[PDB]
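Q: I have two molecules that I believe assemble together. Could you output structure tokens for the complex as a whole instead of separate predictions?
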Amino acid sequence: AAAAMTATRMPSSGSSPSVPSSIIAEEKLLALLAELEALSRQLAALTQQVSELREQQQQ
Amino acid sequence: AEEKLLALLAELEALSRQLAALTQQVSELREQQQQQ
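A: Yes, here they are, computed for all two components at once.
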């Protein structure tokens, strides 16, 4: 009634960026698709000359 | 610094296949010189 009455008396907000580091970029990209063919070409050339041992030993 | 490993890994495997081609192919000389 008196004394104190003179003054006065959720779910999901879904953030995303959190506490990780900063990020950067560059545009000098992508030789790498050539080596996948270099590697599998030269791999064949190994077997090709293993065959050239065998095809001369068989003579 | 991630993509720089993705190069280096393909680089070391290219060196391995190239050294395999060398160290295999020299054995044709070792046969042909024995055959002569």
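A: One point stands out. Chain A touches chain B at residues 31-32, 35-36, 38-39, 42-43, 45-46, 49-50, 52-53, 56-57 (CB under 8 Å).
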